[PDB]
């Protein structure tokens, strides 16, 4: 019932500006959830208020100090 682990959080390398209506506009230092993979350099994601797609280049899978 919506309990477990959706996916991995990714922080935007920098302020991204979506030129197309399909893309998504995000600012440097934001967290987005990836639902499914769109293209080799593209990914899908949904955000509270705005939903669409974004480039996988302006996003990188960060890691936590949880374990060395």
């Amino acid at each position: 019932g919506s309990s477990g682990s959706s996916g991995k959080a990714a922080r935007l390398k920098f302020d991204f500006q979506a030129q197309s209506p399909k893309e998504l506009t995000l600012q440097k230092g934001d967290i987005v959830y990836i639902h499914k993979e769109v293209d080799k350099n593209w990914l899908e994601g949904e955000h509270h208020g705005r939903l669409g797609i974004f480039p996988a280049n302006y996003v990188e899978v960060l890691s936590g100090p949880s374990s060395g």
Side-chain angles (χ1 to χ4, degrees):
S2 307
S3 61
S5 279
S6 280
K8 295 184 271 90
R11 182 195 155 198
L12 274 297
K13 296 206 78 161
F14 305 87
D15 38 65
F16 172 73
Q17 300 153 262
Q19 179 65 257
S20 274
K22 62 205 270 184
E23 280 173 294
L24 270 171
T25 308
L26 316 155
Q27 166 156 14
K28 176 177 169 169
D30 273 313
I31 302 302
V32 303
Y33 312 129
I34 300 84
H35 199 209
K36 79 164 208 76
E37 196 186 290
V38 181
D39 210 61
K40 186 163 158 283
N41 271 244
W42 291 100
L43 312 163
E44 199 153 42
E46 71 209 69
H47 201 275
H48 178 210
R50 286 204 83 67
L51 166 150
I53 60 169
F54 38 77
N57 150 230
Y58 280 54
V59 293
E60 200 203 85
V61 177
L62 90 309
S63 297
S66 65
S67 198

